[PDB]
Amino acid sequence: PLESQYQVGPLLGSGGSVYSGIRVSDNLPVAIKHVEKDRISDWGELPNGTRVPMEVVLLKKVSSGFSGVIRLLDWFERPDSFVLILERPEPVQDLFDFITERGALQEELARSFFWQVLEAVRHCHNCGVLHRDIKDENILIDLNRGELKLIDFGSGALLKDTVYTDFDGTRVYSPPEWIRYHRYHGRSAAVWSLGILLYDMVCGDIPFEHDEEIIGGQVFFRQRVSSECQHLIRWCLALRPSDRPTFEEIQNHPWMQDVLLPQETAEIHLH
């Protein structure tokens, strides 16, 4: 009984389609995401053997406990679609719109956001999940708590140590080894997309729009950015995957020290 357990509100957006909603049981704000079966790329199976979109498999693997990941609360199957019930922060703004409205972010704020994204991606990898579409569009800001949340695992995969030869994420966040050879390893590709994301935050837009820029390996800074932040970005965007930092090396980097707490981030920068 899906139409009798949630009250459906306005469209949030589409690409499937996502609606705002309220769980009738306890007025919990939710998001209601509709996925068309005819569009499902990769399929998986639950423990029960029931075949579901891989997105549902990945979301279940990361939705245990609290984290900076949007949690799946429930899901339903329909004749031609799956319906996903997700948490919904309120008030919320995605990081793309946030950067559009505010311009390049102060480094203190970019540091807090980037730190929280790294903790969220670490949690995904610990749960066996590779997101494969890290970008400002896929990050929500809980404006009152100052907490960031990863969304949209529809391009993700189970994490493995061997080479990936498929990709359906965002090309301008994809690494040069995907552009050149249609091959990448999961962790170093993630670190590349995190370098794009960090440049995006401190410069106000992504560095590369074209394949030639992605493989050229030259990072021009269009805004005043500290030498320490430039170095971290350029390290994340190393052309050779094995030259990129691990997550531990990113979080131990000097630019990453003395991060603000989420509550402080909201009070200083979002309220």
Binding site: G15, F96, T100, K135, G154, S155, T170, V172, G204, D205
Partner: peptide, 8 residues
């Protein structure tokens, strides 16, 4: 210059 979203 033009900042835009990029679809997957």
């Amino acid at each position: 210059r033009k900042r835009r979203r990029h679809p997957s």
